[PDB]
């Protein structure tokens, strides 16, 4: 049986369109370019000013987001246009798949652990549906509650039932990196 997919699919037009949609979502000022300063500011602004992160939590979360978008070639003080963005995302996905195969903590998992410690009011690495609605709407990556509910349908939720970083890292492997058909609708209709 197929547990996952460790092969890239960068020529898939739906993979390009998935991250082009994300690029336009991150380019809120329609400059055609985004910077690491803007991404980390957005990330820290959410957890600090919307989710009540402690200074210790925000520091760990900041280093995780910084390493994530930095893995796509984004740097402080440097503006990244779309050609340099999607090319850097090929390098990010390639490096993450190497960490997946090596059973090495990936950048997307480290971000999830740091973020879920903030989003989970119990700080046990497991978020409820309401907490997932609270983060994704604050970040804006999901706008409707209907699409947030699709996430908990796609994910193997536990008996609570909450979503943990293990399951979300499994779904993000196929959604952001390898275009796993079983990971479709992970963000509902919010992300193509
Ligand atoms: O993954 C996530 C993501 C991805 C992307 C993005 C971006 C570009 C792209 O080209 C493809 C994908 C974007 C976002 C949005 C964002 C938040 C803060 C700062 C900047 C952006 C998220 C959040 C989120 C949840 O949606 C957090 C998370 C990770 C790991 C985990 O286990 C659980 C939750």
Author numbering: -2 to 189
Show passages lifted from the paper:
The Ca2+-binding photoprotein aequorin is a complex of apoAequorin (apoprotein) and (S)-2-peroxycoelenterazine. apoAequorin, which consists of 189 amino acid residues, can be regenerated to aequorin by incubation with coelenterazine and O2, both in vivo and in vitro. The chiral deaza-analogs of (S)-daCTZ and (S)-HM-daCTZ selectively inhibited the regeneration step to aequorin by binding the catalytic site of coelenterazine in the apoAequorin molecule. The crystal structures of the apoAequorin complexes with (S)-daCTZ and (S)-HM-daCTZ were determined, suggesting that the hydroxy moiety at the C6-hydroxyphenyl group and the carbonyl moiety of the imidazopyrazinone ring in coelenterazine are essential to bind the apoAequorin molecule through hydrogen bonding.
As the deaza-analogs of (S)-daCTZ and (S)-HM-daCTZ were regarded as coelenterazine and (S)-2-peroxycoelenterazine, respectively, (S)-daCTZ could be used as a probe to determine the recognition residues of apoAequorin and (S)-HM-daCTZ could be applied to confirm the binding environment of (S)-2-peroxycoelenterazine in apoAequorin, as previously reported. Moreover, the deaza-analog of (R)-daCTZ and (S)-daCTZ for coelenterazine inhibited the aequorin regeneration and the inhibition with (S)-daCTZ was stronger than that with (R)-daCTZ. The asymmetric unit of the crystal contained two molecules of the deaza-CTZ analog/apoAequorin complex and formed 16 molecules of the deaza-CTZ analog/apoAequorin complex, similar to the case of cf3-aequorin. The p-hydroxy moiety at the C2-hydroxyphenyl group was stabilized with I105 and T166 through a water molecule, identical to that of native aequorin. Thus, apoAequorin can recognize the p-hydroxy moiety at the C6-hydroxyphenyl group and the C3-carbonyl moiety in coelenterazine to bind coelenterazine. Similarly, the regeneration to aequorin from the apoAequorin/(S)-daCTZ complex by incubation with coelenterazine was performed, and the results revealed that the deaza-analog binds non-covalently to apoAequorin, enabling the replacement with coelenterazine to convert active aequorin.
